[model samples]
Target: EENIFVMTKERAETQDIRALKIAILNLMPTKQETEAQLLRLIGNTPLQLDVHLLHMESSFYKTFRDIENEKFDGLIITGAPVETLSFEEVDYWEELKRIMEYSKTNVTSTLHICWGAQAGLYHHYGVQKYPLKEKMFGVFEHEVREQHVKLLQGFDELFFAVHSRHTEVRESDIREVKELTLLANSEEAGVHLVIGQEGRQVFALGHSEYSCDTLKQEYERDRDKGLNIDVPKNYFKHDNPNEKPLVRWRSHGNLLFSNWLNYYVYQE
Candidate 1:
């Protein structure tokens, strides 16, 4: 995917100075696929970036001492499959909370995707996640609610993103908080992206980093398992599963990460 805009002055000057150090906390079961999707998005910048994988589970995480000692320019918290359960019930809940707290002072900017979005909301702002009557499981339309924000710099008025969550955070709850700024939302897909702490923390409610086949594979898996899944809306050509799904969100996905890197991480 081509960048929708030019590199920021910070990115241009920093291209040869040093690699932007980015730490990713991968919570998804499919670690490799998640890495590929995120790397593809963040890697598009002109600056050389050094990516590090952070394991939320104890087996691979650094000690509290080590985390405090190392500072990163950017951090990404990927979505997981545990949205239905209470945050306290997740195995890495405490560890994640520690990381989120540390991020406020240590990391330059932290981006949370999907269930990670819900977790960030609950952890930092006392927002609650509600169970959806039906799964929000497809590519849906979203509109840029705040175009002046650097994060949505080049986004079109209307864009598409893939969402596969069974839970959501209500906009009313987000609005009550004075610090949080809603960046984008959808009529059908609900809240899409929000920013807080002057862009230090970004919450994305959809899977903008999802590849073309991610939803397809998910749909197929649920079907084969007889899990009562529906075909992803606005996904496949003509809404037919037999045909290959067209990628409508790649450009916006590319812009999302690039802007985050340039405006939030690089500039900071």
Candidate 2:
């Protein structure tokens, strides 16, 4: 055993270094699951986080109006259920548009998830989402499109992530935007990850943060309600709906958050 003089970096001393101000705009109807999943990724990282879970306003949340005057180290816009609908027709469309614009100057880096990604793409870059013949609901394999991208630095040649979307931002549309850089793609899922405005804006088109049974619940939720929602692909064991899902995507999902914490938040 060799102990060559180790000084403990005291708690307050280390904490004073930085507590990253993070705002999460959770647009999902059932807020608890998204909150749990998002926290799991960002919490285990090597950073101090001052987390603010925001919708518009509530007892547990502080509205955008309250924090619009402040700046944040990071911001996240969660996947909304509005993918099947037009961006302009959503009830909170104008407010979301205002917030998206504010994120440019106020946030050091903003991560947009799923439908939020499509919303940002359309608003800022004029990208359009085409409808899929069937719901792209599944755990699909995604390949690293640009190996050198810092956001995907630890990603495998191919990895798995879940998709539950009815519409997708086209690969060609992303290719047309010189500012938009696609970092990953999938044959089954199509465009998966994209970046723009240096590392300041990231559009992630899948739910890497989804819990193990997230898709399972959605399937049942729809099927029980008398709607025709397909079972999530490559998810359940042997593709059997009743079997437990094979958890294949958590490692890469964790990597995504850590890489983001280091490269985009702290580095900037």
Candidate 3:
């Protein structure tokens, strides 16, 4: 949510022809913060981005209705807090299913994150997600399982990403679908990122958009409520709550979003 470079009208007129129209279905309760996190990454590109934020619970009818009429270059479904619940148990699960089905043809490329990833795997490929005994919290090391993927163009041999979730989609479940490609994963964080439909759909099971302080806030909030929570691993300098969290994931995070926009949305 810090300085994201955006072109002025004059600069834009000279540099590009058309801005990308992207829709974000933000399912997190902290809408504004999530918006800022996403905007910070997408805005960093040279291409001008026209971002439309949609609330998943109340706006799907209007969104898919609009999707039928207008084609979006890209759609991003952000993570939600309903990971512990079954797909049908979620209040907006039916609506989400409808939208996901529609996205295959109407939207050029769709990216699903966290709980959104789990849902996508289930709905599209019959991949089942299992509950983890404990939350997969904090920064974890991830390797590019598949390097040739356009979405992971500039990723290093090993990169770091943020994960805060109670459920996980196993590599075993994901391997069942020959069409789905596992892009990156952590030994500890399970499956980190996956691509399906030849990049038409992408799934990231972590919060690469998270700010350095995001985990800190989560840990603090849970601790304040007397919920048993461990300090996010590989986050704070000394794994001490009092220490500042390291911002190790930002570079790869930016690269991931940039490559997705350039190679998938814009090039498509």
Candidate 4:
């Protein structure tokens, strides 16, 4: 994919700098839409990223010998709506497992979001997720827990995070695992963030790349489908669906990518 737009100052800087490689193993199915959603956020950072889009080869397209033959500096695994079923039941579960293992040593860092986070926690550390009574769907408050300068490199306390997931691993349950830090959490809500394996693996249970109207559209879509959908907390103006949601989380999203690039992906 081509650069849609880069920040002016970043564009002027260093042409000799090696572009950071980012492999987005997107399982969202809607390829173009997810690419735009993810790449738009990465574009805001100062570093140049060579984004590689990847998908699991199902039985239909199994002819290729190798998907990603080249090594990458960083990898991003996206969430899928397949959380309703068990990991073993998912068709691409085995293939995803291979990619996760590949990320452990091959890539400098791996960022797992939402369903991707849950899958990593389970496969990497045997952490399991339980079904929630109601779907977590909205902008939610997250408390920073002993903020690591490496990951929360440029973010502040009480950053706004958007979570839309059907399952969650309670922090209480996850804390039992060694070296797993709950970087952010919501009291009324469940676990929101976790980074483990000593910065090599970072995971978040929210969609930080969501646009301002994303939750609004999702809420309306679910409601139209006769599904139980609640407006996200602290998202819109005075909880009004007619009002546009706040774009308060974008800066933090850029900070996240920047930190990942600076601390894990980039040399300088």
Could you tell me the lDDT of residue 74 within candidate 1? 93
Please give, for residues 1-268, the per-residue lDDT of candidate 1 as tens digits.
6768866656345645567888888889888999889988998788888777787545444444566678889999999999999999998899889999999888999999999989999999999999998889889999998858999988999999889999999999999999899998989989989998888899999999999899999999889999988889899888788899988999999999999998898763
What is the alpha-carbon lDDT of model 1 when measured against the actual structure?
Answer: 0.89
Give RMSD (Å) of candidate 3 vs. truth: 7.0
On lDDT, the stronger of 2 and 3 is 2
| Tens digits of per-residue lDDT for model 2, 7-86 | 88766334445778889999997799898889889985667899987895437787789898999989999999888787
Q: C-alpha displacement of 177 in model 2, angstroms?
A: 0.5
lDDT of 4 by residue, 147-185 (tens): 545877656788877888878888877889896888888
Every model's TM-score: 0.92, 0.92, 0.91, 0.87
Off by over 4 Å in 4: 1-15, 59-68
Instruction: Provide the lDDT at 102 for model 3.
Output: 81
Query: Candidate 3: what lDDT?
Result: 0.87
Winner on TM-score (2 vs 4)? 2
Top candidate on lDDT is: 1
Query: If both were scored by TM-score, which would come out higher, candidate 3 or candidate 4?
Result: 3
Model 3 Cα displacement at 166 (Å)?
Answer: 0.7
lDDT of 1 at 14: 62
lDDT of 4 at 75: 83
* Model 1: lDDT of residue 216: 93
